[PDB]
């Protein structure tokens, strides 16, 4: 039954992957409530749809800055994935459009900050708290991997916690649709699987390694492999030696020993049973997988001069962002 749900999800994904939706709204259909922040390429604004009355978070990307910062491919790739995926723990892109100056990605409004900030505010998570979050990543990676997507950017900064207390994964610039191997070095060093560092090619198994690092940091308060210089972090990653805190349970240490396996042919999530080797592990014995997917489990923790948008008369970077 799980196999046929993924089969229907992949068919739906391939339809939108083949024919991405474009220009599903325009700028004059939204009321500009307030600017929530100014970012790398542009600003993020809280907006209200004039007709429906719902609230959305509109990201405005200056097309010229995107070109200068060499982020053209990452921007188009994120938009193509977001308009085609559909899963409870992924940020939902509601509308997208462009004009002469900017790109516009109208997102669902999610207040509640990133996991990185909360992790530094609390310190560390209790094992039941971490398991709640880890279970969501497991289902998310099961979904993305079934679409042949390697997320390969798992880190606390890319995990928001919504008002319901659930995880939403946000940054999809690096995500690549791969069936065989790939080689591009990307992602934060602390979460890189050893096969990435060795530059011998890698597949979806690097995501399960990243989950291993993520569970460790949540339960310990600090990542398993860390040093002042990246080259030292690389050595510790390839060496594989991990030290667990005393408060780590026996089940947790066993799961991490199988997720943080240096040999990708022995790593949990990359065996014949696939993701089920993780779901059926003793550490997740109390985990109701269907309930987590349905967002029924109670969350362990729940979280002015406005400037105008100038739309130039000249079309900017029309060639680069044609597919947006």
Numbering used by the authors: 14 to 316, 330 to 350
Task: Quote the study on this structure.
We also collected a dataset for PKAc in the presence of the Ser1718 peptide. This 2.75 Å dataset contains four PKAc molecules in the asymmetric unit referred to here as Apo/AMP-PNP PKAc, as it lacks density for the Ser1718 peptide. Three out of the four molecules in the asymmetric unit are in the apo state (chain C: ApoPKAc1, chain F: ApoPKAc2, and chain H: ApoPKAc3) and one is bound to AMP-PNP (chain D). Based on these criteria, our Apo structures (apoPKAc) depict an open state of the kinase, whereas the AMP-PNP and ternary complexes correspond to different intermediate states. Most notably the ApoPKAc2 molecule adopts a conformation distinct from the other two ApoPKAc molecules in the asymmetric unit. A DALI search of ApoPKAc2 yields top hits of some of our previously published PKAc:RyR2 ternary structures with RMSD values of 0.6 to 0.9 Å. The main difference observed between these structures and ApoPKAc2 is the glycine-rich loop (residues 47–56). This is expected, as the stable positioning of the loop is largely dependent on the presence of a bound nucleotide and can vary greatly in ApoPKAc structures. Nevertheless, the ApoPKAc2 molecule adopts a conformation that most closely resembles a substrate-bound state. This lends support to the conformational selection model as this conformation of PKAc appears to be thermodynamically stable and can be sampled both in the presence and absence of substrate.
β-Adrenergic signaling activates cAMP-dependent PKA, which regulates the activity of L-type voltage-gated calcium channels such as CaV1.2. Isothermal titration calorimetry and enzyme kinetics show that there are two Tiers of targets, with CaV1.2 residue Ser1981 and Rad residues Ser25 and Ser272 forming tier one substrates for PKA. These share a common feature with two Arginine residues at specific positions that can anchor the peptide into the substrate binding cleft of PKA. We report crystal structures of the PKA catalytic subunit with and without a CaV1.2 and test the importance of several anchoring residues via mutagenesis.
